[PDB]
Structures are given as C-alpha cells and as structure tokens.
Paper text:
Xkr8–Basigin is a plasma membrane phospholipid scramblase activated by kinases or caspases. Xkr8 is responsible for exposing PtdSer in apoptotic cells, and its deficiency causes systemic lupus erythematosus–type autoimmune disease and male infertility. Xkr8 requires BSG or NPTN to localize to the plasma membrane. BSG carries two immunoglobulin domains, one of which is dispensable for its chaperone-like activity.
Nevertheless, X-ray crystallography of Fab14 and hBSGΔ–Fab14 revealed the structure of the extracellular region of the hBSGΔ–Fab14 complex at a high resolution of 2.51 Å.
Author numbering:
A (entry chain H): 1 to 126, 133 to 214
B (entry chain L): 1 to 217
Amino acid sequence: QSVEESGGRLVTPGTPLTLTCTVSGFSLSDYAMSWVRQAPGKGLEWIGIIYASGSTYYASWAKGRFTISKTSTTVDLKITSPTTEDTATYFCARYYAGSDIWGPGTLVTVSSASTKGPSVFPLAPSGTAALGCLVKDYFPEPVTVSWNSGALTSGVHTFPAVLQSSGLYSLSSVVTVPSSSLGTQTYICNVNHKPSNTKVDKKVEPKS
Amino acid sequence: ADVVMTQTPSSVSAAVGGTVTINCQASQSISAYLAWYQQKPGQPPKLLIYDASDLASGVSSRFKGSGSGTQFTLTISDLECADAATYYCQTYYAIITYGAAFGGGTEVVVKRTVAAPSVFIFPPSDEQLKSGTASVVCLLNNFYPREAKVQWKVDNALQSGNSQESVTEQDSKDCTYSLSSTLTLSKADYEKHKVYACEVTHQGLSSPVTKSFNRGE
C-alpha cells in the first residue's frame, strides 16, 4: 500500500491548480484520504478529508479555497485561487487510526517569476579533502544533487537552499574524501532541476 | 469550531541515551483519538503512535504515548542521533465536527560531546567569473554544538551584509551539523582585492582557525 502525489508546479497567483494523489495496494472504497500541506520551514496543516462514500470535510480556512474530489483510484486537490500562502509541499495520506500511509509530497510555488535553471560551478579541492558543487541562481525549488550517480554517499552534505535577495535560490553540495584520492578517483556532481529540465554532471577536480 | 492542538515545548533536548518528553493539549476533550508522527528532514511524516498509546507496526517501543482527554505526552527514551527530527501530534476525534488539526511541532536536539569543525575555503571558479559575480565559500564540516562564528575579511577589512549561511540538520549517525558561509561579490570588486579569509570560532577549537587564499595564486 502506497500513494504518490503529482502536479505540484510553479503557477501564477490566481491560476487554479489541481494536484493528484495516486493510490496503490488499497481501495478508496475502503478508506478515507486527507490532504495536508507544509510551507517551507513550517508545520503540518490538515486541509481536508474525503470519506469512502464521498463526503468531503475541510478545515475552517480551507472551505471554499480548495476542492477535494476522487476517482476510483486517485484523489485530487484543486486550489481554487492560489496565493503565496499556498506555496507549500502537499501530501496525501490514508486515514485509518490516524494517517498511516503518506506520499513523498509535491511542491507548489505561487509566483509571477519565471522558471530559471541553475548554473553549476566547482568547489575545487585545495588527510581529508573537501570538494563540492555550487548550484546557483535557480527558480522555483527544488534541486537535487547526487555524487558519482549515487555511488558516493558517505560524507556528503547538501545544504538547504537559500533564497537570495534576487528572488533566485542557491545551494551547495559538498563531500569530504581522502586527500590521496584526488589524484586517482573521479568526483562528479549530478544536479537535477526538473522545473527547468536541467540535468548537469560536473566533474570537480583540483585546479591546475 | 475546529479543535486546536497546543504542542509544547517548541524544542527539547537530551543526550544520546537520554529521554525527552513532548506535550500536546487539546482545546476540548478528544478521548484517546490522538496520533504522534516523526518527520525527518526532506521526508513525509511517519506515524509512530495512534489511539494515544498504541505503537504503529515496526516502531520501536522507545516511543511511548500517554494521556487522554485534553492532555497527551510522547516520551522518547534511549535517544539516538537518528531521532533528531520534528514530531507532531494530531487529533482525529469526530473529524466531521472538529477537523483533524496537527499540533505546531517540536524539534528534538540530540546532545553529544563537543566536536570541532574542519574548515575549508573555496575560491570562485574561473567559469563563474564570466557571469560578473564571484562566490567565495567557507565550509565548516561536522561540528557540535550548533553555535559557530564565521568571520570574513577581505584585505583585512571585516565584511558583513554580503554573506549567507546555510546549515544542515543533525547527522543521523554522529549528531553533528555542517555549515556553509557564502560571500558574494561582483567580479569587479573581487578583482580589486587580494586576501580572502574565513576565520572560525567554535567551542571545540582552542583558538580560531583561519583558512585563506590569495586571488590569483
């Protein structure tokens, strides 16, 4: 039994947006489902629930601002007239005794700003050495970073994004490795910014 | 009106092996219809406890729920670095009448011995300089506690207003933090100065550590 949210994207204020929760391994004729959201850095907020028999109930602030509906195997959340209060990760969750099955979430960004893909720059290494990638000037969130296609995980730190005063995000990802490996191993950061279709592999090496 | 769950404190701490206590107060009686969740950074919430005191399958009995009516507690014993997370309660009493609000959350901070950061400085890449901007990065790796002081100097002049810090959450194995401080200058300004220096002060360092480079060397 699992669920997965989709449809989170950048939208301009006032543009209705529908998110979808796909369910698997249980029936919506047997279980109620809720939608929950979480603004960056903030808490969980219960939006509403749709019971097996179809009745919907909303938090007091959600009434008239969201519509929950369902098909035989999906649950939708329509955000009637998005504002920046609606920039958040949205989750669907199965109700049984509390909410037991949750999806990974889908991210909604409400803004008039345009999508922009990042530039990726090396943080070049100077018995433990550090190296990294600077992922600069992108919009909206999110970006993911891996190292050596996921083969390098020990010692990796990918920092939370910062919103710069320009309105664009930045982050770095770093890793510490043995200094003796700089001459012999290859270190590549794999950067993905799905909103702009950007996927970059950057080899990071000592500067000559 | 919707039930309100008042969750306190906003953060709670104990050493590895210790115990913390997290409280929720419901605005009216919700009987035993209360759940507790753990949320690690980047992940969805995970159900720990339902019906106030029943463990979700697979969850460690280190997590104990108690209470009824209007007062509930989550007690986490034998604390581990992997317990560093935010925890939430939620009502599910009579949702059709009262909603299913979450409490505001409580962070858990897992305490450990002092660990000094390793410090590294990175000059801007030549590629970035083509943009007309230079980013200089100072990395503080794997330190505890969180408090750390980063000083930037350019040709021995103290800088402020042109840097931003980012910090990771506590590592799930070693309880440490890592931190980046990024100084942003125009290329034009970067090329007017020679010495770029990051000086770090931290409880684990007997005196401050400075990492520096000379532009062009």
